[PDB]
Design the sequence.
């Protein structure tokens, strides 16, 4: 809930696990990266794309 | 004869159908073909059993 302070999310589409329910989920050792999308390849960040 | 059936897929071949299609749809097409051939094998072994 603290992640909404900087900017509202634009894409928000998530594959696989549901982003709506995350407080009841348990997991470990997550990876975090950071890069840029110039604007017309937002849908290109998906499996099977070229 | 049922090996050469299309089973609702684009082609009945295996090696050629991998190159022409991307994996996100090739996996679904292969899964459909495998389920159809397994159903045909189930019909064959039921006939053989009776």
Sequence:
């Amino acid at each position: 809930s603290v992640l909404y302070n900087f900017a509202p999310f634009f894409a928000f589409k998530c594959y696989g696990v549901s982003p709506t329910k995350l407080n009841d989920l348990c997991f470990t050792n997550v990876y975090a990266d950071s890069f840029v999308i110039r604007g017309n390849e937002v849908s290109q960040i998906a499996p099977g794309q070229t | 004869k049922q090996l050469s059936s299309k089973f609702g897929a684009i082609s009945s071949v295996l090696n050629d159908i991998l190159s022409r299609l991307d994996p996100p749809e090739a996996e679904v097409q292969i899964d459909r073909l495998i389920t159809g051939r397994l159903q045909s094998l189930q019909t064959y072994v039921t006939q053989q059993l009776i």
Notes: The radius of gyration of chain B is 13 Å. The CA atoms of residues 7 and 33 of chain B lie 6 Å apart. The first helix of chain B runs from residue 15 to 20. Chain B touches chain A through four residues (CB under 8 Å).
